[PDB]
Amino acid sequence: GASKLRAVLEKLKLSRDDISTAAGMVKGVVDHLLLRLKCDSAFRGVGLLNTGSYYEHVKISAPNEFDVMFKLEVPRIQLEEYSNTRAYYFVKFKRNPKENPLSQFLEGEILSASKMLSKFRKIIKEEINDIKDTDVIMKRKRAVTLLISEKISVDITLALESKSSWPASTQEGLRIQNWLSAKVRKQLRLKPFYLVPKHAKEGNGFQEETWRLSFSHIEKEILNNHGKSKTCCENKEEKCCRKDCLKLMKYLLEQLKERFKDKKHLDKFSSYHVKTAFFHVCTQNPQDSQWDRKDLGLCFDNCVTYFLQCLRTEKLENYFIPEFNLFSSNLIDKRSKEFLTKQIEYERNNEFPVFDEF
Ligand SMILES: O=C(N[C@H]1CCCC[C@H]1C(=O)O)c1cnn2c(O)cc(-c3ccccc3)nc12
Ligand SMILES: [Zn+2]
């Protein structure tokens, strides 16, 4: 039975125009910040990445919330893996010429995430007061969050771009060979990779000089060209339910996270856990016949089921970094995974009551 699922998808599709209205305000403010950021010597090669739920056509439930990525090309870099994490790294430089534009942010031979982000926040803070066209406020440190016309929030991330070969930790990741082909995997790995400033906490405290790997652009490519067949979702006979299953999984977590926001258990779960689990199910079911539109109910049930297995077994590997486990006991406590398991199972057993705005 896919009736309630198909109902939700139609309701979610009605948010397209509202998201579009808000997006216009954001494109205006962002184009302005990039024009002013490009003036500084350090952030000269800064640009808009254009990755995320929005550009992957999976943006469900929040027109007053946008996430934007700012890429900055860094030329000849050397990476040093932090504490055998496989996902966190220190950014070092190797050549002599020319005079590196980021020299000002070096805290030794290592590029400071804090000094980099401070200048980024400083230029952004300086340019939001100069702009009079719309009312823009910058929200406090908790990378940079704006509030346009007192409604739209914009989360702005800075990401370093490296056209180098992907780190060794990714060597056995992106298992798309039997689904999207090895030909495609070769083409995709030749593309750049990004590093977003994210500190790593070992329990005692922060490492505020590390950068985490990002493949937002590859996730978009894979989601927007997702079939084994090149004509998947181009004709009546070749329509699939891949994206619809991801939209439903994303919405399932958001609704349950909303329902229990005052409880604090589900705070550690994110749409990235859902998306990662989704890509794993795509690897398990490589055929477009396994994703038939008529089988939506059965396909979403495998996604729910796989996600629950990950919660029980405390095992959800990053799709690009196999050795990094997103459901490690050190990241998410067992009681929290058990609460989310309890809730998802109840929902599945009662024809998803949370789909009806709880
Ligand atoms: O939200 C995200 N992730 C959350 C889920 C658990 C771990 C960090 C959490 C957080 O940063 O809040 C997230 C959104 N894109 N993206 C991405 O492109 C890569 C990674 C990633 C994560 C771990 C290891 C290697 C790469 N994460 C993300
Ligand atoms: Zn398709």
Numbering used by the authors: 161 to 302, 307 to 522
Original paper wording:
Cyclic GMP-AMP synthase (cGAS) is the most recently identified member of the family of cytosolic DNA sensors. Cytosolic cGAS binds dsDNA and in the presence of ATP and GTP catalyzes the production of the recently characterized second messenger 2′, 3′- cyclic AMP-GMP (cGAMP) which then binds to Stimulator of Interferon Genes (STING). In humans, the binding of the cGAS product to STING causes a conformational change resulting in recruitment of TBK1, and interferon-inducible gene activation and interferon production via IRF3 phosphorylation and nuclear translocation. Activation of cGAS is important in host defense against pathogens, but uncontrolled activation of the cGAS pathway has been implicated in autoinflammatory disease.
The evidence linking activation of the cGAS pathway to autoimmune disease suggests that cGAS inhibitors may have therapeutic efficacy.
